[PDB]
Design a protein around this nucleic acid. Structure first.
Ligand SMILES: Cc1cn([C@H]2C[C@H](O)[C@@H](COP(=O)(O)OP(=O)(O)OP(=O)(O)O)O2)c(=O)[nH]c1=O
Ligand SMILES: [Ca+2]
Ligand SMILES: [Ca+2]
Ligand SMILES: [Ca+2]
Ligand SMILES: [Ca+2]
Ligand SMILES: [Ca+2]
Ligand SMILES: [Ca+2]
Ligand SMILES: [Ca+2]
Length: 325
DNA sequence: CCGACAGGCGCATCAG
DNA sequence: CTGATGCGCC
DNA sequence: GTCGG
């Protein structure tokens, strides 16, 4: 499918090992940055030396590319693939609510399969129970057609609670993707700003629960909701898969920093925020602030557009669709 | 010789 | 109960 | 694991 697919799959596979098994989050980030920059690279890689010229590709990854180009495989990945404890820790992380730490603890106590998870539901917290319950469904992708139906429902139900709410579907959907992993809703309301909860998120969640769109809750606070949703199914047909849904209530005046973050992609955001540091700024979902001599953020800069944030760090403006891999 | 590596919400655990 | 720290996730 | 350096 892809030009350097073998290379990027390998580096992605190695990344997952370092994150899930070794618990080295920055090694995982290094492999991702290496995979990302190679993916965009428009030439077919003929050697490890050619790859090392790209930023984020060093001596060790170059050698691994040489081994991959020569033999068509990696001995390190063979060793990891065949190791049972590694595979079990790597598998359990795919369940929503289980990360590297918990997965390891489960494997130590003889829990290595879905069978073992379902038989030992008592050992799992609420977040994890739901992730286990809809395991197969959360693995599936959401067609854009279904994302449009989900958008129609959420916007209509949000309007019915209050006409001054504005909901925006971000994520890969806003980047014009054919499919998505889940729905990401960015919410605002005039009553909530950075200068001044009133149950603003609750009322929207409650109304979406009331009409049976939202089926479960993984976690829920005043600004951030995290849970499960499902489209209405017709008569005599199989039900739609249960889908992950995130709703985030960001202050109305800080919408553009918010929508920038939640539009993505993830590696794009990491690069932008990393580039902001080198330019002497710091970016979060709320603001863009200048860094002091000791790395202390100053007062928020005036942001009106998404482009404004790009301008401060001398970046050519990329439309949502140009922020993918 | 290290350090930094994006940044923060919700939830959980520990020491006091 | 705080405050510090860590987990899982976005 | 890479860059900074
Ligand atoms: C997971 C993750 C998300 N994000 C941001 C970018 C994402 O667009 C946003 C939440 O979107 P996600 O639903 O996490 O991912 P996505 O929508 O980009 O891709 P998919 O279609 O597979 O769901 O938050 C990060 O900056 N870093 C991360 O590690
Ligand atoms: Ca590509
Ligand atoms: Ca390089
Ligand atoms: Ca998980
Ligand atoms: Ca998404
Ligand atoms: Ca999401
Ligand atoms: Ca049902
Ligand atoms: Ca402007």
């Amino acid at each position: 499918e892809t030009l350097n697919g073998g290379i990027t799959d390998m580096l992605t596979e190695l990344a997952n090992f370092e994150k899930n098994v070794s618990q080295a989050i920055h090694k995982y980030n290094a492999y991702r940055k290496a995979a990302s920059v190679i993916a965009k690279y428009p030439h077919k890689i003929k050697s490890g030396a050619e790859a090392k010229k790209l930023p984020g590709v060093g001596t060790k990854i170059a050698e691994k590319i040489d081994e991959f180009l020569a033999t068509g495989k990696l001995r390190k990945l063979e060793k990891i693939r065949q190791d049972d404890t590694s595979s079990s820790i790597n598998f359990l992380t795919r369940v929503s609510g289980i990360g590297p730490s918990a997965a390891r603890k489960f494997v130590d106590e003889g829990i290595k399969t879905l069978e073992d998870l379902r038989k030992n539901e008592d050992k799992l917290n609420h977040h994890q129970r739901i992730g286990l319950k809809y395991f197969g469904d959360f693995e599936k992708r959401i067609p854009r057609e279904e994302m449009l139906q989900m958008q129609d429902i959420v916007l209509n139900e949000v309007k019915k609670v209050d006409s001054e709410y504005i909901a925006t579907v971000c994520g890969s959907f806003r980047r014009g993707a054919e499919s998505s992993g889940d729905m990401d809703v960015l919410l605002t309301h005039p009553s909530f700003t950075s200068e001044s909860q009133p149950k603003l998120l609750h009322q929207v969640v409650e109304q979406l629960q009331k009409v049976h769109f939202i089926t479960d809750t993984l976690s829920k606070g005043e600004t951030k909701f995290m849970g499960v949703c499902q489209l209405p199914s017709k008569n005599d047909e199989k039900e739609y898969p249960h889908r992950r849904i995130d709703i985030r209530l960001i202050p109305k005046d800080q919408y553009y920093c918010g929508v920038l973050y939640f539009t993505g992609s993830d590696i794009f955001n990491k690069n932008m925020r990393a580039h902001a540091l080198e330019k002497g700024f710091t970016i979060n979902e709320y603001t863009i602030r200048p860094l002091g001599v000791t790395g202390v953020a100053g007062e928020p800069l005036p942001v009106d557009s998404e482009k404004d944030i790009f301008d401060y760090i001398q970046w050519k403006y990329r439309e949502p669709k140009d922020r993918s891999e």
